[PDB]
Design a protein around this nucleic acid. Structure first.
Ligand SMILES: [Zn+2]
Ligand SMILES: [Zn+2]
Ligand SMILES: [Zn+2]
Ligand SMILES: [Zn+2]
Lengths: 554, 553
RNA sequence: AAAAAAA
RNA sequence: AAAAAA
């Protein structure tokens, strides 16, 4: 629980600033002799408890004042959950060298155009090693949801470190590039002192299915459908876009992208040769309303029914470009991320009134996870035989699972280190051990101005769900004398006009026990009025809107 | 298109809630002027209904013809079927509410909460009652909570069967299956309309038996080395029974924890629906007293509702209990869509503690309480209704349940997808949709009704990003300002000098309207808002509410 | 697919 | 197990 000692010269301190008690805002910090290497730098996403904010970030208040001690930032892949906070760490220090694959940095480039940022790009590949001051980094292909992921090895005077990333052990991925358990196992034979292991699906047993399976079940599904077909998947997942495109043209339709993420992500994936699609099969969103329904497949956006994603708008007709018939077939080619049920289950239900057949994961095999199930994780622990393990990229139920997996491999119980954000692992003399914790908290991004939206701002943003009633009196500067009748507004409270009318009376009465008591102070007459209006809505409604007084002096 | 006069002698069914969604179930049958209402419950608030506490059916169609209501009849005691009973009997204390022994003992406590006593009629299976122009026979249905019944309403227009909340488990622990024979004899006499459960009509096959949960628990407690904690809905006496059976079979004893549980289990016992030797019950004082391997705690909070009992011990803010990592907690429940975040939250908190958490995804510790599509097929074959109308479900669930009934022989014309407030007219044998009427969500915020609505809610949604108030004092009639603007914010920023740039921006626009010699307070407050509203957009790109106020003096 | 009920 | 974007 107390902050760690100074790091024994010659050891590694590894500490996570996000992603070890959640799923998102991944950022882990390695220090060796005062120098710092960072792996990943992604975002979270705000829930119910974080009501006004755009994005949550890792708590970079320790790198905060150490910016010249970081040698480079290394990137497993290009998820938002691993590169979202980049344009915010680099604003602080625009010349961090950011290392990552050919596709990862391409997405890091476009997200850094939104901020007037050109970064220090060092593009790597698998089997490559680059050098970074004290640190030496070796890269390994990881097949996964999005192209070109890499696992990362970190060589240092404390020993060898393996970091896996969003990793999945599919022996038949459609791109031809399986995760590289061969290589990682060779590195195991040398010695791996600590293994930073993704634990997303350590709970799920067995071995998950191959992305290769999803392709047949669309080829069949597009076959059997008489009318137009539209398919919504994620946008990082271009293996599956290619699968849909294959199945599409194969049967004679023509593909058509719909949505800003989709249109732009496929653009880059073709420019880099990750997609491959003749222009004869690509048409624009216009022609979908042109050509007979049976001759077009729409690849759209918003598998979480986020309220203005392409497919969410289409389920309301409010997507002026195209409106959905009942001969349409929507196939939710994705997973239902926890916390987005009301959105997506509402959207399917909205689609059901319209009368269009919808196929989701529960009915078919249209989606396959992006992470190793607990039995593909059993391969890694056996091929790498790590000397200590530190579960990562998941919540506590997922890290606890993964610990048991690793222990069940023979990794001793001491060498398992459940290291929640801000708690640090120290690797000196080849032993790994928990050093100490530091407070790690959430940094919000509400629009354009930083630092100013806090636990207070949010607390009252949750208050305001019951609305507010406002009182407003004016006064002659020194007197208590009101100069005008009080003025009660309210928003988010009731929609009866007369709702506040018993309250304008009770204030008027209060407002003159004030006058008949020579309360000259604006603040005190603001308080007493505020209390009369609280205690009224209290007794009368037992609702608790925020009661906001305002006392102007003239 | 509204519905015309029910040509005399016919029967008109209209759902006033329960058919667009899952919840607030209330179905209204009209026959010759008089009305029968089947069920009356609540939909729990969601993420598009911010401050409300309970969504009720739109009884705005029936608040006038209250004295035409012959009786309110109850399939079982789910809050999705008896929640809004006091919000109905406050309008008419003397409505006769008809239900089974258990089903009525819950309307008891629910309405006690509200200073109400209702006029009861306690019925059982295979037994008729008459209610004015309606006669009602009751058939036992097997379901998650005890003593549910399906309902048949014979009237001069034909004969209707209402399933309620049906499931066809063939080995219920209580030992009293759903009365599918009965329903098939009633089928041989010919039913003209079936109101069929639609909840799980999308899942193929025949769901599992409550009889399977028993063993899984008996294993889990036998294998556990410390204390055990099981969470299930307080309605499910049968589940709480095989939890209890298991514990005492293993020299353990039991302690309940939670308003719902402790209440509903004492009642279950008083009415002999749960049988437990006083010898085998202890209290939470004696719970933490004894050895862990002696106890089994039966708790609330399977949905991780924030103030629940488990969700308290997950956070260590519980008096008389604290969860060690030697504990085994069992979420003997499902995960209603919409409470993932909440349940996982509690599962994670429990994980950081170190105690094993067996959910329904790693063992057979829960079974659904609504028939799967293969079970429903035993019903369309057993009843053979001439017309089918699906109920108790969402829209993807209705299209499913409608498809089942076509595949089973009912003509497409005879399968009637009648939404909330949409009417269906059985007029001498034939069934058809006779139009619709607007129907909505009666919200219950605090102590009033009809008070909150669409635009109130839409405001509470905007206020997730705060408001900014700009306040102008003016000399009456002139439009001439008398102080400088007074900006405030509240859920916008903690930068105390955040609005300062904007006072100088609204002064210039007050100074721009005085030259306009525009003196209207409405219009000046329009201008003092669009200014400060597009300074927040420009400078901050945040989108709070803008509340102008212009007090003239 | 029904809630829950103030450390 | 990641977003959506006129
Ligand atoms: Zn990730
Ligand atoms: Zn990933
Ligand atoms: Zn129900
Ligand atoms: Zn039920």
């Amino acid at each position: 629980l107390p902050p760690p000692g100074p790091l024994t010269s010659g050891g590694l301190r590894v500490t996570a600033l996000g992603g070890i008690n959640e799923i998102g805002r991944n950022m882990t910090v390695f220090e060796h002799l005062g120098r710092l290497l960072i792996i990943d730098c992604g975002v979270l996403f705000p829930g119910h408890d974080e009501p006004g904010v755009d994005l949550i970030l890792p708590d970079m208040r320790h790198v905060e004042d150490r910016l010249d001690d970081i040698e480079a930032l290394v990137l497993t892949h290009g998820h938002e959950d691993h590169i979202g906070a980049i344009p915010f760490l680099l604003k602080l220090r625009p010349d961090i060298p950011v290392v990552g694959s050919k596709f990862t940095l391409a997405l890091v480039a476009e997200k850094c155009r939104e901020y007037r940022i050109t970064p220090v790009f060092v593009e790597v590949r698998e089997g490559q090693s680059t050098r970074h001051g004290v640190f030496e980094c070796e890269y390994f292909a990881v097949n996964h949801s999005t192209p070109d992921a890499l696992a990362i090895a970190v060589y240092t005077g404390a020993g060898t470190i393996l970091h896996t990333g969003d990793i999945k052990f599919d022996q038949l991925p459609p791109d031809g590039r399986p995760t590289d358990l061969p290589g990682m196992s060779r590195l195991g034979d040398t010695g791996v002192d600590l293994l930073l292991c993704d634990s997303t699906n350590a709970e799920i047993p067995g071995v998950g299915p191959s992305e290769s399976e999803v392709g047949p079940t669309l080829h069949r599904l597009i076959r059997g459908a008489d009318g137009r077909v539209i398919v919504a998947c994620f946008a990082s997942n271009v293996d599956r876009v290619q699968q849909i495109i294959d199945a599409a043209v194969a049967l004679g339709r023509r593909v058509s992208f719909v949505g800003r993420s989709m249109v732009r992500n496929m653009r880059v994936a073709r420019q880099l040769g990750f997609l491959r699609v003749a222009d004869s099969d690509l048409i624009d969103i216009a022609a979908a309303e042109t050509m007979a329904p049976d001759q077009v497949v729409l690849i759209t956006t918003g598998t979480q029914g986020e309220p203005m994603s392409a497919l969410s708008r289409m389920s309301r007709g409010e997507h002026r470009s195209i409106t959905l018939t009942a001969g349409d077939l929507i196939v939710l080619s994705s997973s239902l991320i926890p916390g987005n049920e009301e959105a997506v289950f509402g959207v399917i239900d909205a689609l059901s009134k319209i009368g269009a057949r919808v196929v989701t994961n529960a009915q078919a095999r249209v989606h396959v996870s992006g992470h190793a199930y607990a039995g593909e994780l059993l391969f890694l622990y056996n091929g790498v035989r790590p000397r200590n393990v530190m579960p990562v990229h998941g919540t506590w139920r997922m890290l606890r699972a993964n610990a048991k997996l690793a222990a069940s491999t023979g990794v001793p119980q001491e060498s398992i280190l459940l290291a929640e954000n801000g708690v640090s692992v120290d690797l000196v003399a080849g032993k790994a051990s928990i050093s100490g914790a530091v407070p790690v908290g959430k940094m919000f991004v509400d629009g354009l101005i930083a630092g100013d939206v806090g636990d207070i701002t949010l607390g009252e943003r949750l208050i305001l769900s019951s609305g507010f009633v406002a009182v407003t009196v004016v006064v002659r500067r020194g007197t208590g004398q009101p100069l005008a009748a009080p003025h009660l507004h309210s928003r988010g409270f009731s929609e009866d006009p007369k709702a506040l009318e018993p309250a304008v009376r009770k204030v008027e009465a209060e407002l003159e026990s004030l006058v008949a008591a020579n309360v000259t102070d604006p603040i005190r007459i603001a308080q007493g009025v505020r209390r009369t209006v609280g205690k009224w809505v209290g007794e009368t409604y037992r609702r608790q809107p925020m009661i906001v007084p305002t006392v102007i002096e003239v």
